[PDB]
Amino acid sequence: SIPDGFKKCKHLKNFPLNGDNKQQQVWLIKFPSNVDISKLKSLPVDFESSTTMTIDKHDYKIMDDTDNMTLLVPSESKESLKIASTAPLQFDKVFSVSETAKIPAIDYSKVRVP
Amino acid sequence: IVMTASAAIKTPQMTLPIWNDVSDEQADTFCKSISKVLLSEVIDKVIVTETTGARSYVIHMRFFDNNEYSEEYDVSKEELQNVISNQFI
Amino acid sequence: SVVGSLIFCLDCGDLLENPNAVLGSNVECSQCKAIYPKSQFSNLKVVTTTADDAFPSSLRAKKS
Amino acid sequence: TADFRTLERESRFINPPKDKSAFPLLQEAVQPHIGSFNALTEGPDGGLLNLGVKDIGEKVIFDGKPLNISNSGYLGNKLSVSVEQVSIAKPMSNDVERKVYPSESRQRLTSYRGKLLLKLKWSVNNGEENLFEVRDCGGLPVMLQSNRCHLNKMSPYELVQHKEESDEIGGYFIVNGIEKLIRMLIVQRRNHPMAIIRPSFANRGASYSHYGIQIRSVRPDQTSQTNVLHYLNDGQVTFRFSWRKNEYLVPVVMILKALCHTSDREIFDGIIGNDVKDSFLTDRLELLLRGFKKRYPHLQNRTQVLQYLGDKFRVVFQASPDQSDLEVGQEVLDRIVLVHLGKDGSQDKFRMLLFMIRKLYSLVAGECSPDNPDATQHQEVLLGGFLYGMILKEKIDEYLQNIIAQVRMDINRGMAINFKDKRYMSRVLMRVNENIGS
Amino acid sequence: SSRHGQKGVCSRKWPTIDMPFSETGIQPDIIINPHAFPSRMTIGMFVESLAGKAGAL
Amino acid sequence: VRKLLPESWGFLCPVHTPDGSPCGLLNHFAHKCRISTQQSDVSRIPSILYSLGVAPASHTFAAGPSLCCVQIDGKIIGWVSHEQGKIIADTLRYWKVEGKTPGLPIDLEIGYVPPSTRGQYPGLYLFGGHSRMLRPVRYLPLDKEDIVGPFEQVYMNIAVTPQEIQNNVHTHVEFTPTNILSILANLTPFSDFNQSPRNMYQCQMGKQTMGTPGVALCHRSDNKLYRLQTGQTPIVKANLYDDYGMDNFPNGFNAVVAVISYTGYDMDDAMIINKSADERGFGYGT
Amino acid sequence: MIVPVRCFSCGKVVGDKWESYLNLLQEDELDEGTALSRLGLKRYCCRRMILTHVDLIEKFLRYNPLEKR
Amino acid sequence: SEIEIESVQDQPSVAVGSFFKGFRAPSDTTFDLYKKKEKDEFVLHGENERLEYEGYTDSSSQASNQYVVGLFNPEKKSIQLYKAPVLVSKVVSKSSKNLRG
Amino acid sequence: CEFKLELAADTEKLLMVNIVEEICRKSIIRQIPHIDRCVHPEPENGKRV
RNA sequence: GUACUUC
Ligand SMILES: [Zn+2]
Ligand SMILES: [Zn+2]
């Protein structure tokens, strides 16, 4: 019982995993705390990263990265975790959402004075 | 020269006159023959794949082509092989 | 895993010594004894290449 | 067409403004000096000197009296001492208290001298009781336009009434009736690895290369120590330390894996790992770790590594005798290696130190141009007042060294009754020097 | 010395008894040699003498 | 170390320097340059950094010049892709100059470095601790006051005056190009119409005059002093002579200069004075 | 400091038009050109002589050790 | 390609752990995970014959960062947002309890 | 030019590019005493040197 | 002894 924290785990959830030999794979992204994890209902998926989300703040860009880290799969409750392995389990293209604020640019009308 | 007890200097210099029958197209031949060239300046890249399985080593030393190293630094197999077999090793 | 000419261990989270400097077909860890090895590591090969930095010459300047 | 001022100039010559003075740029010209000496009072944690004596360390010593194998093992009781609070408030004088003026200070041919109060947190037997005591340490010389002098928030018209300048600048000491100014000091970059190629490392280094990269940490009270990394042609790499007049060469491993638990692939993983194609990483990393296993094969965990550090460095910082290797080891460590991370900085200390040594490998692999020790790329400016505060923090512990030396000197001649008496605290507090102002 | 870099030492104190006077009446109190400009190149004193002339005219 | 470097542009005055042995040793700060004398307690630089899209420090596991290592003062937070560093190199500029950001101080050091030309280890530098130097500069997009330090002008280019500014290859502009000069040099009229050997030769002259030290004579007890009485303010002067209240401290006077070889008693290094001027008290001091 | 009377080069009596020049700038609104010339100053050296004065005596008088404050 | 979200939750059960590169994953012993509830902080530990797990979740800065995970099939083409608390761990051993007086 | 060498198990790890670079900058094709480079300059005042 | 300045 190290450390002396609040409360151990008691609730679990089952993940439907088939393990197909086109292939059901995981999807992880990166996002800050001030996000729309509850009020967002749609997110466009695209090719090599060039896109932008449209919400109240309206400055976003979904970045991708190709090039590790093990993920436990809670198949049941009494153990609350397992080891994901097919033959462990690697990944292909991790997602990391960024906030590309549009920089106001190119006003060459008042700075260039005779 | 005056006070430091002149000895082997950084850049030694000597001037050599020449006859009137020799030409500039023949002087550069003696320039290449007398000018000492480093043995490492005839290698493109030094790739070696160190193996283990009893240490084992293989050395593959890429060189230039005949028109490059033999026409530029006037060396050939009878001197390059003798120095790589008697001095380098 | 196996990378280069060195193999690591996961049951204790460290690396092991040279299988040639010590007795062969049976090597141990440094902080705790484990059943090891399987005597089937690999055929150890590695490649090193000079970056062509300290080789100056007149023809090295003409190749640019 | 910048016409000069005659009416405005005549008005400011007749009477200075009762409100904030004009041309505030002259007042902003000494913002480095004024802000430097004023920084040790404002801000959180009482300022620089207060957080300095907060993170100053606690020191103890024993006595020659027994209590009553384990009985003879225990050699004497425990007395504790540490500098708790230090504060300069305001200059004053007497035969109630009266206020002094700087104009009268240099007219008296003396220095502007306030007073320094020191609060000692004296303890005993791991805090069983605390003999509270406050003793002054003389007067501290203060310049003008500071938090101590009364010229901080005084109107310029009142400055004229105080026999001062209408646009007084201040920020300079006065001693023995003559003025004086502390010269600004030049240092290099703080908390940034600096690449340097210098043949001086080959003179003090027996058959060592000319490569080098340095780190100058910084404590919250701005006191620091220099930690540099050399380069070894054999394949290894070593730090060098800086003590009173001593240099300590030390391999990277015995102090890299000694802060907290990091002995695993996280080291090789912290190394560049996007590709394992180039073997200039493999030959150097294998030779480095092999150079750590060949020396002491029975050193595998940070616990035993910290035991060996505390063992070899037991009597270097005068940390004895109850502070075992597990205490003196972590104490001298957190004070010696990139102290700018502060306490509990071992979470990413290996990540910052690995980034330092990995920039060394990037410096020797031939893709990073060396910097310059004189260029403005790494030009830092110590404003003098900060150096004055660092000298205060440094030269305050000498009182602590003199009282522990007084206790261990009185225990030699015996006749040292129990230190639980206030009059014994006084008879031992008067033997130690207290004049810091001089 | 002025703010332009040129310096000078007072050689001999001489009154207006023999110094060149102007048609207006003003007497030049100080006199500098024109033989320093070829090398010292203090033309700032030239442009500031014209500017100073207008700035006081 | 005696010689200077172009990186000293607008940080330390390349004009104020004595002659002889102290050449290149001592040279005071710039005209309007600032010095941060306190750490602004932010505790939000990472709170907006990794929120912008920067990966954490415990889950990056990389190195090398292929990743921009973002470095806060002392503490590190990790490295990201070089394209991220490029966007952040200007994103942090916009959020810095914008006043609606409570978690970003105005006196914040921000630097960017490309990886080409085998330069030093790239990344994204962030500083602002003690012993840090600033200087004012104008930002063209939504033109507003800004400040930079000893690392900004290293890589990103600046414009000295709004006449060499051109398209998409500049980020900052300078208000008055005389701010690089010192107090003695900027007070010197037409310092551009002279020589540098004259600027070093005059730096000691202006720093060796016999002006008024301050109106405290009857209440000072220092060893030695000097005082003039014909203190006059120069007709020609910069706006800093008034901005610094230098009129309160008259150091010299104004006299009619007659460029003529009539005296004969002087040769390119000597001088001659009017006896009548000495009768009036030409530079009379005690 | 003090008003330099009898300009070294010109020699005119100039220590008298000081308070008059101040009054012209106080309650007459005349600019430097026609007012400084109205005083009776026509030569170049006497133009700059009065115009350049700084009258630092006001700063030299704000400190009197023979009077309370 | 716009896509929707179906599954949400309030209490997490999955976790991503970072030990090092190249873990053979023996998967022969279950390690326990202790939780909390500030917010977004967890911990886990484990024991073996030569291995002991020890993992925390960015105690310095974790409350201002969150990771999610999902799944998608060619027929579904949609993801499900699931709270995945990230955790960094360090494999520890036992060679302690030795000291010189 | 490719040649292969063998070695026992007494030494485990060595440097290849370093020990070869040293010998590469220490072998000389022909040793002419106390001279390494010659230049044919331009003749000054008609005196070819 | 330490610092500062003159061509
Ligand atoms: Zn093992
Ligand atoms: Zn006149």
mmCIF file of N, CA and C in Angstrom, chain D residues 91 100-114 142 144 163-164 174-178, chain F residues 219 221:
data_model
loop_
_atom_site.group_PDB
_atom_site.id
_atom_site.type_symbol
_atom_site.label_atom_id
_atom_site.label_comp_id
_atom_site.label_asym_id
_atom_site.label_seq_id
_atom_site.Cartn_x
_atom_site.Cartn_y
_atom_site.Cartn_z
ATOM 1 N N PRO D 91 17.915 51.912 8.986
ATOM 2 C CA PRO D 91 18.987 52.503 9.790
ATOM 3 C C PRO D 91 18.438 53.458 10.837
ATOM 4 N N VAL D 100 18.379 58.656 10.911
ATOM 5 C CA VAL D 100 19.593 59.256 10.384
ATOM 6 C C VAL D 100 19.368 59.626 8.924
ATOM 7 N N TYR D 101 20.253 60.472 8.402
ATOM 8 C CA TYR D 101 20.188 60.930 7.025
ATOM 9 C C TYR D 101 21.483 60.604 6.293
ATOM 10 N N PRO D 102 21.415 60.346 4.985
ATOM 11 C CA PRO D 102 22.656 60.051 4.248
ATOM 12 C C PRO D 102 23.565 61.257 4.110
ATOM 13 N N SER D 103 22.998 62.458 3.965
ATOM 14 C CA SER D 103 23.820 63.662 3.883
ATOM 15 C C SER D 103 24.655 63.837 5.145
ATOM 16 N N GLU D 104 24.047 63.599 6.309
ATOM 17 C CA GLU D 104 24.791 63.626 7.562
ATOM 18 C C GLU D 104 25.730 62.433 7.691
ATOM 19 N N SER D 105 25.491 61.361 6.930
ATOM 20 C CA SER D 105 26.335 60.175 7.033
ATOM 21 C C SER D 105 27.730 60.441 6.475
ATOM 22 N N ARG D 106 27.817 60.979 5.255
ATOM 23 C CA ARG D 106 29.125 61.302 4.699
ATOM 24 C C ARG D 106 29.695 62.591 5.272
ATOM 25 N N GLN D 107 28.849 63.458 5.836
ATOM 26 C CA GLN D 107 29.355 64.602 6.584
ATOM 27 C C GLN D 107 29.984 64.179 7.905
ATOM 28 N N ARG D 108 29.589 63.025 8.438
ATOM 29 C CA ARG D 108 30.212 62.447 9.620
ATOM 30 C C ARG D 108 31.472 61.659 9.284
ATOM 31 N N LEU D 109 31.813 61.544 7.998
ATOM 32 C CA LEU D 109 32.978 60.786 7.539
ATOM 33 C C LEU D 109 32.883 59.315 7.934
ATOM 34 N N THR D 110 31.664 58.784 7.973
ATOM 35 C CA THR D 110 31.408 57.385 8.276
ATOM 36 C C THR D 110 30.554 56.789 7.163
ATOM 37 N N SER D 111 30.228 55.508 7.304
ATOM 38 C CA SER D 111 29.430 54.793 6.323
ATOM 39 C C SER D 111 27.963 54.771 6.739
ATOM 40 N N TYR D 112 27.086 54.680 5.743
ATOM 41 C CA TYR D 112 25.650 54.562 5.983
ATOM 42 C C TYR D 112 25.384 53.180 6.561
ATOM 43 N N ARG D 113 25.189 53.112 7.876
ATOM 44 C CA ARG D 113 25.159 51.849 8.603
ATOM 45 C C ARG D 113 23.804 51.677 9.273
ATOM 46 N N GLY D 114 23.097 50.611 8.905
ATOM 47 C CA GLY D 114 21.855 50.248 9.558
ATOM 48 C C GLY D 114 22.076 49.260 10.684
ATOM 49 N N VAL D 142 24.135 50.183 3.361
ATOM 50 C CA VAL D 142 23.096 50.269 2.343
ATOM 51 C C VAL D 142 23.333 51.519 1.507
ATOM 52 N N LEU D 144 21.860 54.314 -1.606
ATOM 53 C CA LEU D 144 20.710 55.202 -1.668
ATOM 54 C C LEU D 144 19.648 54.650 -2.615
ATOM 55 N N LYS D 163 18.887 68.155 1.992
ATOM 56 C CA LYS D 163 20.248 68.446 1.542
ATOM 57 C C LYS D 163 20.746 67.384 0.561
ATOM 58 N N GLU D 164 19.907 67.063 -0.415
ATOM 59 C CA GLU D 164 20.215 66.079 -1.444
ATOM 60 C C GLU D 164 20.075 66.717 -2.823
ATOM 61 N N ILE D 174 28.582 54.435 0.328
ATOM 62 C CA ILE D 174 29.475 55.461 0.857
ATOM 63 C C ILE D 174 30.110 54.916 2.128
ATOM 64 N N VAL D 175 31.439 54.970 2.198
ATOM 65 C CA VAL D 175 32.195 54.416 3.314
ATOM 66 C C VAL D 175 33.317 55.382 3.666
ATOM 67 N N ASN D 176 33.461 55.667 4.961
ATOM 68 C CA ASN D 176 34.531 56.528 5.471
ATOM 69 C C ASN D 176 34.488 57.910 4.824
ATOM 70 N N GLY D 177 33.276 58.408 4.587
ATOM 71 C CA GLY D 177 33.080 59.731 4.035
ATOM 72 C C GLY D 177 33.266 59.857 2.539
ATOM 73 N N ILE D 178 33.790 58.836 1.867
ATOM 74 C CA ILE D 178 33.994 58.866 0.423
ATOM 75 C C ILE D 178 33.006 57.910 -0.229
ATOM 76 N N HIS F 219 27.319 70.451 1.266
ATOM 77 C CA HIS F 219 26.990 69.272 2.057
ATOM 78 C C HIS F 219 27.667 68.030 1.493
ATOM 79 N N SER F 221 31.655 65.956 1.498
ATOM 80 C CA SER F 221 32.917 65.850 2.221
ATOM 81 C C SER F 221 33.850 64.863 1.535
#
